[PDB]
Amino acid sequence: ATIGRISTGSKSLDKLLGGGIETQAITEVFGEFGSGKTQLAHTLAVMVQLPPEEGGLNGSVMWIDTENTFRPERIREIAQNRGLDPDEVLKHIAYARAFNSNHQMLLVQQAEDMIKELLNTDRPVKLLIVDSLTSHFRSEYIGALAERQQKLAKHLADLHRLANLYDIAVFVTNQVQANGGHILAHSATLRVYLRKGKGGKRIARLIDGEAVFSITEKGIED
Numbered sequence: 001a002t003i004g005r006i007s008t009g010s011k012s013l014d015k016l017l018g019g020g021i022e023t024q025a026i027t028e029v030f031g032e033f034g035s036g037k038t039q040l041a042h043t044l045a046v047m048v049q050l051p052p053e054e055g056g057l058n059g060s061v062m063w064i065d066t067e068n069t070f071r072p073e074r075i076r077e078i079a080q081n082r083g084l085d086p087d088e089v090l091k092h093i094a095y096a097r098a099f100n101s102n103h104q105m106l107l108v109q110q111a112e113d114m115i116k117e118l119l120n121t122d123r124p125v126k127l128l129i130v131d132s133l134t135s136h137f138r139s140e141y142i143g144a145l146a147e148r149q150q151k152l153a154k155h156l157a158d159l160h161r162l163a164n165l166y167d168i169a170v171f172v173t174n175q176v177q178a179n180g181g182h183i184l185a186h187s188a189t190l191r192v193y194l195r196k197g198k199g200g201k202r203i204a205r206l207i208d209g210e211a212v213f214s215i216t217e218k219g220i221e222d
């Protein structure tokens with residue numbers, strides 16, 4: 001398949017990304033608590049449902065939530081201010097809460113079943129969100145870094161296999177703050193560092209210029 005792109009909602013961020021986040025890729029956004037990673041996830045879950053002329057892929061979404069941070073009412077707001085019907089947008093987001101890191105890993109295998117079901121339809125899965133990818137692994141493997149890295153490596157490999165095999169954009173969030181971080185090392189296809197700037201602006205930089213945007217009723221925008 002050709003590489004598809006999903007607009008982030010921000011022209012600035014899209015330019016930094018060469019058009020948007022890519023299918024057949026894992027995009028990892030990392031930064032401190034409150035930097036806006038989950039807002040970017042919510043925005044992408046709407047944008048992907050637009051036609052390509054507006055920066056989407058007419059795609060369906062699968063969302064794995066590890067922190068109970070998915071907000072359907074926020075999806076509705078973004079959809080309504082992106083000219084889409086909010087009920088339709090929500091009907092095309094499959095949502096699951098991961099109870100722990102082992103359940104999170106099983107949910108990726110389950111996602112493949114729905115991906116296959118939708119593959120030949122007019123609304124194939126085009127976006128798989130894992131928010132937060134690292135939170136359960138970090139809390140469960142305190143004092144056991146070597147074992148944590150083994151499990152994370154397999155999880156990321158599963159996500160790669162889905163991105164490439166089914167032409168999906170995988171978008172993952174990772175909280176990194178004071179003294180923290182192996183990030184995801186070199187595993188993601190693309191690492192985006194997100195931070196707060198003056199006056200509520202958000203600033204993004206590729207790790208391995210900078211885009212600037214705001215969180216609004218449209219999700220994010222310049």
Ligand SMILES: Oc1cc2ccccc2cc1O
Nearest residue numbers: 062063094095096107110111
């Ligand atoms: O109905 C489902 C929703 C999911 C969401 C994310 C990951 C896996 C899922 C599996 C489902 O059957």
